[PDB]
Design an enzyme around this catalytic site. Structure first.
Site, PDB file in Angstrom:
ATOM      1  N   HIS A   1       0.783  -1.241   0.000  1.00 43.66           N
ATOM      2  CA  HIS A   1       0.000   0.000   0.000  1.00 43.66           C
ATOM      3  C   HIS A   1       0.817   1.294   0.000  1.00 43.66           C
ATOM      4  O   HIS A   1       0.245   2.379   0.076  1.00 43.66           O
ATOM      5  CB  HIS A   1      -0.924   0.035   1.215  1.00 43.66           C
ATOM      6  CG  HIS A   1      -1.796  -1.173   1.362  1.00 43.66           C
ATOM      7  ND1 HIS A   1      -3.135  -1.170   1.027  1.00 43.66           N
ATOM      8  CD2 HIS A   1      -1.538  -2.403   1.868  1.00 43.66           C
ATOM      9  CE1 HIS A   1      -3.664  -2.341   1.329  1.00 43.66           C
ATOM     10  NE2 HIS A   1      -2.716  -3.108   1.842  1.00 43.66           N
TER      11      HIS A   1
ATOM     12  N   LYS B   1      -8.754  13.409   5.030  1.00 42.77           N
ATOM     13  CA  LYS B   1      -7.880  12.248   4.970  1.00 42.77           C
ATOM     14  C   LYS B   1      -6.884  12.444   6.102  1.00 42.77           C
ATOM     15  O   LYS B   1      -6.794  13.535   6.653  1.00 42.77           O
ATOM     16  CB  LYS B   1      -7.146  12.220   3.627  1.00 42.77           C
ATOM     17  CG  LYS B   1      -6.454  13.528   3.285  1.00 42.77           C
ATOM     18  CD  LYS B   1      -5.868  13.478   1.891  1.00 42.77           C
ATOM     19  CE  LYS B   1      -6.959  13.312   0.844  1.00 42.77           C
ATOM     20  NZ  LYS B   1      -6.500  12.475  -0.287  1.00 42.77           N
ATOM     21  N   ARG B   2      -6.138  11.405   6.456  1.00 40.34           N
ATOM     22  CA  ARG B   2      -5.173  11.547   7.539  1.00 40.34           C
ATOM     23  C   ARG B   2      -4.167  12.650   7.204  1.00 40.34           C
ATOM     24  O   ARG B   2      -3.774  12.809   6.050  1.00 40.34           O
ATOM     25  CB  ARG B   2      -4.453  10.217   7.794  1.00 40.34           C
ATOM     26  CG  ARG B   2      -5.311   9.168   8.507  1.00 40.34           C
ATOM     27  CD  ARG B   2      -5.640   9.578   9.948  1.00 40.34           C
ATOM     28  NE  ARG B   2      -4.452   9.589  10.806  1.00 40.34           N
ATOM     29  CZ  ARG B   2      -3.995   8.539  11.485  1.00 40.34           C
ATOM     30  NH1 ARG B   2      -4.624   7.370  11.428  1.00 40.34           N
ATOM     31  NH2 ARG B   2      -2.894   8.652  12.216  1.00 40.34           N
TER      32      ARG B   2
ATOM     33  N   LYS C   1       0.448  14.037   1.638  1.00 44.70           N
ATOM     34  CA  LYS C   1      -0.904  14.326   1.159  1.00 44.70           C
ATOM     35  C   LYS C   1      -1.031  15.840   0.918  1.00 44.70           C
ATOM     36  O   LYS C   1      -1.973  16.310   0.282  1.00 44.70           O
ATOM     37  CB  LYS C   1      -1.941  13.834   2.176  1.00 44.70           C
ATOM     38  CG  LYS C   1      -1.988  12.307   2.289  1.00 44.70           C
ATOM     39  CD  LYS C   1      -2.929  11.838   3.389  1.00 44.70           C
ATOM     40  CE  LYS C   1      -3.018  10.311   3.462  1.00 44.70           C
ATOM     41  NZ  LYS C   1      -3.769   9.721   2.324  1.00 44.70           N
TER      42      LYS C   1
ATOM     43  N   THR D   1      -8.720   6.333  -1.676  1.00 41.92           N
ATOM     44  CA  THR D   1     -10.076   5.813  -1.834  1.00 41.92           C
ATOM     45  C   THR D   1     -11.088   6.932  -1.575  1.00 41.92           C
ATOM     46  O   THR D   1     -12.217   6.882  -2.063  1.00 41.92           O
ATOM     47  CB  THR D   1     -10.363   4.618  -0.874  1.00 41.92           C
ATOM     48  OG1 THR D   1     -10.001   4.967   0.464  1.00 41.92           O
ATOM     49  CG2 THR D   1      -9.582   3.385  -1.301  1.00 41.92           C
TER      50      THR D   1
ATOM     51  N   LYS E   1     -14.808   8.048  -3.321  1.00 39.99           N
ATOM     52  CA  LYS E   1     -16.052   8.381  -2.647  1.00 39.99           C
ATOM     53  C   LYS E   1     -16.548   9.740  -3.122  1.00 39.99           C
ATOM     54  O   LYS E   1     -17.741   9.915  -3.379  1.00 39.99           O
ATOM     55  CB  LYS E   1     -15.823   8.406  -1.139  1.00 39.99           C
ATOM     56  CG  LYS E   1     -15.237   7.110  -0.589  1.00 39.99           C
ATOM     57  CD  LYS E   1     -14.773   7.316   0.837  1.00 39.99           C
ATOM     58  CE  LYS E   1     -13.907   6.155   1.321  1.00 39.99           C
ATOM     59  NZ  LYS E   1     -13.323   6.444   2.662  1.00 39.99           N
TER      60      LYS E   1
HETATM   61  O1  LIG Z   1      -4.785   0.504  -0.299  1.00 47.04           O
HETATM   62  C1  LIG Z   1      -5.549   1.267   0.627  1.00 47.04           C
HETATM   63  C2  LIG Z   1      -4.819   2.533   1.034  1.00 47.04           C
HETATM   64  O2  LIG Z   1      -3.645   2.128   1.786  1.00 47.04           O
HETATM   65  C3  LIG Z   1      -2.910   3.241   2.317  1.00 47.04           C
HETATM   66  O3  LIG Z   1      -3.744   3.949   3.167  1.00 47.04           O
HETATM   67  C4  LIG Z   1      -2.429   4.149   1.184  1.00 47.04           C
HETATM   68  O4  LIG Z   1      -1.751   5.269   1.728  1.00 47.04           O
HETATM   69  C5  LIG Z   1      -3.620   4.612   0.334  1.00 47.04           C
HETATM   70  O5  LIG Z   1      -3.166   5.368  -0.778  1.00 47.04           O
HETATM   71  C6  LIG Z   1      -4.402   3.403  -0.166  1.00 47.04           C
HETATM   72  O6  LIG Z   1      -5.550   3.848  -0.876  1.00 47.04           O
END
Ligand SMILES: OC[C@H]1O[C@H](O)[C@H](O)[C@@H](O)[C@@H]1O
Ligand SMILES: Nc1ncnc2c1ncn2[C@@H]1O[C@H](COP(=O)(O)O)[C@@H](O)[C@H]1O
Ligand SMILES: Nc1ncnc2c1ncn2[C@@H]1O[C@H](COP(=O)(O)O)[C@@H](O)[C@H]1O
Ligand SMILES: OC[C@H]1O[C@H](O)[C@H](O)[C@@H](O)[C@@H]1O
Ligand SMILES: Nc1ncnc2[nH]cnc12
Ligand SMILES: Nc1ncnc2[nH]cnc12
EC number: 2.4.1.1
Lengths: 821, 821
Positions: free
Chosen positions: A362, A553-554, A559, A661, A665
């Protein structure tokens, strides 16, 4: 004829309608008998619980038949191992998935209760940090919806992600005691506790390797039903809870052994090498695999004898998907069990192991990858270290065989990393013990193959796959945005809910006056609703006609919430400069949590509030600009703000966001996107068409060109007057009169050590934003472009994602056929 | 007409037969929907739970109506505060009290399940040490059976009295994780948590005394229904659980605040001055009184507004009974609440306080009385200490007024005790703040008035009462001995079950051949049953024709298990001496727990096993004598062994056992008694007639005569050859070949510092035992004497006890009328 006890027990039947009348009785029964309450003292929370237990019965009935069905058919079971499961609320999702929402709404109405009110009572099951945990949640929903015999295994943290409080503009973490009023959806299985070993040492003997003198902590499973969409398929989410295996002090000390499952580590995309976190990973792994093997063995329906002792079919009856490297210990643990306990020979056990496990990456960021120092593993899990070393030698020999004489290659691909501290590279471990390694978005998977995992891709190209992420359309559309779902259904029916690509049909209405009007109306409605919830549950202000600019987002430097902040201030100054110029009214909302130890992220949160205190009270600005920091961003909040957004901020530095993600959304809910060609943004832009996106900034290539020469923020600073103006305000104390030096760290980082090159994308970001405000001046065109986005968001349904995981990795075929009821 | 939400909620009705068919459906519903199980995986434990939940519904329905009934009538509420509640098992007791046993037995039988088997699955709710805690349990049962609006308030220990294991003949304590598989009978009320303060300090201000900078721990109540006998009255037992009010460490530390309700202090008749125990006492007190006052205020039915703000009627609507001094802090706490929080003036608050509280004493032994050092109270509860001091000054002034010039009397009656360490005498505190102080048996209450509480009795004679203890006939006869209950019912009907004095009618059958025969048969049956349970759940041996000599109770020097041991060895030697003499076969069973820190008690347990190892394997003895140490004595074990006993050992030193209750259970179940004129033994002997008892030893008077002259064990030693023989065996290592000096402490104590004068009663004890064996040789006469005991045990029903508490202390009248169903 006298029936024996066996014939009699046949009456122990699953039995006992989704009737408004029947729902009423049960609600009434649970309120009194289950809750030990009555209308004289019943609170809204009590009524919510009565409803939860009522729906739960219908969930449980399906669950039992579903699980009984899997034993009857013995399908390949899919195990999704994850340290996080960002579930959110369950009531509404359960009702919609079981088609009980209308009947339940009516039943409660007839009792003088408001179902929406009861739903707000429920707390989030926030056993996750962000994307990774939420993905696991969407995945469970999609696997059940696609009729896969899937399972989710993780830890039942007593305390999930901290509830973020804001005081003095600073983030203040508070324990998330999500279990305070109990959890009606889970079912404890104190009878199925399993032993987990720690420490001790290994004795090599003529009857195997014996891991002795270990410390034992027990793992107790808690089951939570997971419903598929209208197919009567209810899978299982199994989370583990730690239990203990000067008299008074001894008893008080028992509780200490349970700290393993006490709290979720609040790190997002960041590796913290704490032994406790390592214990959590092994804890979940050891318990999960014992359970997996146990279920594999007792395959006969109605019989619990371990009839299946041969492992030949193990890889065809089991699949373990590693969510990141957190559960990577599953590889050496499976080997330990098979070799040390089942007496299987190494090679045959390794074949089974590799055919069972698959690894999902990820992130490519160095600080997010797990590299456990060997002295730690050696003390906590000596046997696993021995196994890890053996795996490495076997693996390295194969590398040597494929690239004879490649000395440096042995160093690079080794599972053992030398350096200041000798560590084990868990990603390398996962690649070596998995028949599949997948990225989480096209650009990300390609990057993996070209950078960090390039050597491995050359050795075993076949292993590397891509599985572009997705979100579930039930929760992220039907639940969170019923107004939009309704407007859509009126045109194309309800099939899209379980076949998102169906949304493309909306393209035929891009010129439909009514559709254009109705789409804009839902948004407006959502804007008002959010403004309401905002000023009623907190202090808030709105001009619901202003453009809702949202970035949730975090909080991370990659980011770039800071890039967003630079824009905000730039706009502030611009409005002040030319007070007699028209400016598209905008409400910039920034929300997200920062890991407690992430100093910079906390400073960023503080910047957002500091900016707000100035902007929100400047009479010359009026309500042409409002800056808000959305407190305690979580799944249930996401469900409210995202449907209300106009602009989606997906501005990470090209190449850093593996996928994202939230961006999905946002698109699914009617917001246009301003972002870089990073992660899944690329495919989203491709689907909707680039003219319908606000793409800006450096591409991956450019970022690299700058890296090879060396990034020098000063070069942009010296040529962009507006930027210098913004930075000097931050530096001189304009946004912190009481503390002139409050933002020194932020400035010094941006100017001298910005790994994410904010200054490099500044100019193009500002220009792109102007382009955004311009289109907003044309409501008809803004909405037609929205339609062009929503209609092409189909590819991002998690069902599509799971379908590919199932077919390209697990070897199982998706099903939409329903079980009876 | 459109009904408002108020009219609609009226449907939230308590509704939904004790039918075998209906029980079947529900059992089936709970097994699947509540347990999330099915017959494919259901274990006996699962079926037990299914049954528990099924019965629970019928318990809960009654409970709600009972509690609703109390608000409708606003009767004086009785609050029994206790640090212990030795409940035992609930399934059978609930079924018999609700008359569901037969219907449930049939329902399970029809499903191919054995109800007796399911019942054995249940664990004890052992939140008690012994008599004191078990008394509270019988009391709850009797209060509900006598239709009193009674409540039981205490702590919900996560770990009750330790499960005693025996290894190497030694007691080995193991945590009693009674909550492992959950507790179906309790209902958590996370919504009604209350704050409890600790530490901090007091600021005296013009608007009251303010207790500031305190540490807060929350108290969460767990409700458990308590059913009366066939009257549909179900009261409440409310137990409190503690809850919390470097990020990770902070979260892990939350759990530490909950250690207050973690484990029950394993002390019986012994004061251990630990701050944690003190915190437990305050914890239960503060939460309980807040709850009591809250319920008092919201008196209107259907309305939860605090409509009753005036305290004038508080003493007529509330009664707080202090079980020993453990909850004595209720006195200064009630004063604190009224004065500091309600702004009531001191005198008026003190009047209310004294009319509300009553104190029950359970021992005259110095080491069992609570005397908390002032430095501890001062640090933990400064305000309460200030209040305690004021109470003492007010009280002492009254003493001065009644006995002018009595200097030493001020010293004696003071709540503040000087000495090596300055302490607060809690008994003195209770007497000063209670309108009633009662002993627990006639001889005990008289002793109180003449010794330790003599000064107080002279100041306020009216306060002192006696309330001879009792046991509940439902659990201690109907449940534990159905065979005897059945044989009895056949003759006099079932009225005795709720009117024990009815048993006197049995006197008319003392000459009935069939009755005599049937009574002996039940005993024999019970003897076989116990021998079975004994050798099937442990290792055991029996000759069920041998006289069952049983002594079960907590191990104490004052209870004299050692005197019993001296007899055992004496008999052993006697049998060996004259191998050609007839000896009545006897099985001597000794069981009970020892507090972990009570060294002597542990040595005594070890003596029992050491003796057994020798006696049980001596061929010359054969099965004419067997010595057994009954492991892990508890309520459910008591329910099995007591009905199987022939001889009840109640041999405490005259004046030490305040009352005893096991002695009552034994008498009710068909065993004859050998004991001293101590505690309730005296009244038992009086009821049955002394010719029908085996009374022996020194009377209270004699013990005193010996105390004033000085006890010299050597004097008996030098004149009793048989005794010297026994002691020398203990001393020389006969019972511990491997460790000759193993029993040195025991010998040295018996010889040089025996506070309970074992040697003084030895000769008469041995002679009395011979008399016992002699009567046993005449089975007809032995049983007729048994009948004479059972028929006169009526006075010892706890209903009679409670009836007197209700009428002579609480000011409420008992009721046998039933609520509808
Ligand atoms: O794969 C699910 C998520 O994993 C981590 O949070 C990544 O930073 C993000 O970009 C990705 O969408
Ligand atoms: N051998 C079996 N035959 C049929 N159903 C079973 C069997 N073992 C388990 N089940 C069902 O599957 C559910 C989940 O069990 P498990 O797979 O052990 O987690 C149980 O609650 C039963 O309803
Ligand atoms: N004001 C009231 N009127 C009628 N019933 C009540 C009232 N308050 C409580 N009850 C009932 O009494 C039970 C015990 O409540 P409590 O006395 O607060 O412990 C509740 O579960 C209700 O069934
Ligand atoms: O009052 C109940 C019981 O309290 C204590 O346990 C006493 O030691 C005992 O004699 C008495 O029967
Ligand atoms: N989560 C995090 N991200 C970046 N640096 C950190 N330093 C400590 N925790 C961190
Ligand atoms: N329960 C107890 N009885 C007597 N002495 C003790 N010393 C420590 N605990 C004791």
């Amino acid at each position: 004829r006298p029936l024996s006890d066996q014939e009699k027990r046949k009456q122990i039947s699953v039995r006992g309608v989704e009737n408004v009348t029947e729902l009423k009785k049960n609600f009434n029964r649970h309120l009194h008998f289950t809750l030990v309450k009555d209308r004289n003292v019943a609170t809204p929370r009590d009524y919510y619980f009565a409803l939860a237990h009522t729906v739960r019965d219908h969930l449980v009935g399906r669950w039992i038949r579903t699980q009984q069905h899997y034993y009857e058919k013995d399908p390949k079971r899919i195990y999704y191992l994850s340290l996080e499961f960002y579930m959110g609320r369950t009531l509404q999702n359960t009702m919609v998935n079981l088609a009980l929402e209308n009947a339940c709404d009516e039943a409660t109405y007839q009792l003088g209760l408001d179902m929406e009110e009861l739903e707000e009572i429920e707390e989030d099951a926030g056993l996750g940090n962000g994307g990774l945990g939420r993905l696991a949640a969407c995945f469970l929903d999609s696997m059940a919806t696609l009729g896969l015999a899937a399972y989710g295994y993780g830890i039942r943290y007593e305390f999930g992600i901290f509830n973020q409080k804001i005081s003095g503009g600073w983030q203040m973490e508070e324990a998330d005691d999500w279990l305070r009023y109990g959890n009606p959806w889970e079912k404890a299985r104190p009878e199925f506790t399993l032993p987990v070993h720690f420490y001790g040492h290994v004795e090599h003997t003529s009857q195997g390797a014996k891991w002795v003198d270990t410390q034992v902590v027990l793992a107790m499973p808690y089951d939570t039903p997971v419903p598929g969409y209208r197919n009567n398929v209810v899978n299982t989410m199994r989370l583990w809870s730690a239990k203990a295996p000067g008299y008074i002090q001894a008893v008080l000390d028992r509780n200490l052994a349970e700290n393993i499952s006490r709290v979720l580590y609040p790190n997002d995309n960041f590796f913290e090498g704490k032994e406790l976190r390592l214990k959590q990973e092994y804890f979940v792994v050891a318990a999960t695999l014992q359970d997996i093997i146990r279920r594999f063995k007792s395959s006969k329906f109605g019989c619990r004898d371990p009839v299946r002792t041969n492992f030949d079919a193990f890889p065809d009856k089991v699949a373990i998907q590693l969510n990141d490297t957190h559960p990577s210990l599953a590889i050496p643990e499976l080997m330990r069990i098979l070799v040390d306990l089942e007496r299987m020979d190494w090679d045959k056990a390794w074949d089974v192991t590799v055919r069972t496990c698959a690894y999902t990456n990820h992130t490519v960021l160095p600080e997010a990858l797990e590299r456990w120092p060997v002295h730690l593993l050696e003390t906590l899990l000596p046997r696993h270290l021995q196994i890890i070393y053996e795996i490495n030698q076997r693996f390295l020999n194969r590398v040597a065989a494929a690239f004879p004489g490649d000395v440096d290659r042995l160093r690079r691909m080794s599972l053992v990393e030398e350096g200041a501290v000798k560590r084990i590279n868990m990603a390398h471990l996962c690649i070596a013990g998995s028949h599949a390694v997948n990225g989480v978005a096209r650009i990300h998977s390609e990057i993996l193959k070209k950078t960090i995992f390039k050597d491995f891709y050359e050795l075993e190209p076949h292993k590397f796959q891509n599985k572009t992420n997705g979100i579930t359309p039930r929760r992220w559309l039907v639940l969170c945005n019923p107004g939009l779902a309704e407007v859509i259904a009126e045109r194309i029916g309800e099939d899209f809910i379980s076949d998102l690509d169906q949304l493309r049909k909306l393209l035929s209405f891009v010129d439909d006056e009514a559709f254009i009007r109705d789409v804009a109306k839902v948004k407006q409605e959502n804007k008002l609703k959010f403004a309401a919830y905002l000023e009623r549950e907190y202090k808030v202000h709105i001009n619901p006609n202003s453009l809702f600019d949202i970035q949730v987002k975090r909080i991370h430097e990659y980011k770039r919430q800071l890039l967003n902040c630079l824009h905000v201030i730039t706009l502030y100054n611009r409005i002040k400069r030319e007070p007699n110029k028209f400016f598209v009214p905008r409400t910039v909302m920034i929300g997200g949590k920062a890991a407690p130890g992430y100093h910079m992220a906390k400073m960023i949160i503080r910047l957002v509030t500091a900016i707000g205190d100035v902007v929100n009270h400047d009479p010359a600005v009026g309500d042409r600009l409002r800056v808000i920091f959305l407190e305690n961003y979580r799944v249930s909040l996401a469900e409210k703000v995202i449907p209300a957004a106009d602009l989606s901020e997906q501005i990470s530095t090209a190449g850093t966001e593996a996928s994202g993600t939230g961006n999905m959304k946002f698109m699914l809910n009617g917001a246009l996107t301003i972002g870089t060609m990073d992660g899944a943004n690329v495919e989203m832009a491709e689907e909707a068409g680039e003219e319908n996106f606000f793409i800006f900034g450096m591409r991956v290539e450019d970022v690299d060109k700058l890296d090879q020469r060396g990034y020098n923020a000063q070069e942009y600073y010296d040529r962009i007057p507006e930027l210098r103006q913004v930075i000097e305000q931050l530096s001189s104390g304009f946004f912190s009169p009481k503390q002139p030096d409050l933002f020194k760290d932020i400035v010094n980082m941006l100017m001298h050590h910005d790994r994410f090159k904010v200054f490099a994308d500044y100019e193009d970001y500002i220009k792109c934003q102007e382009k955004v405000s311009a289109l907003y001046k044309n409501p008809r065109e803004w909405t037609r472009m929205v339609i062009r986005n929503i209609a092409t968001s189909g590819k991002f349904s998690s069902d599509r994602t799971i379908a590919q995981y199932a077919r390209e990795i697990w070897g199982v075929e998706p099903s939409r056929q329903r079980l009876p009821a």
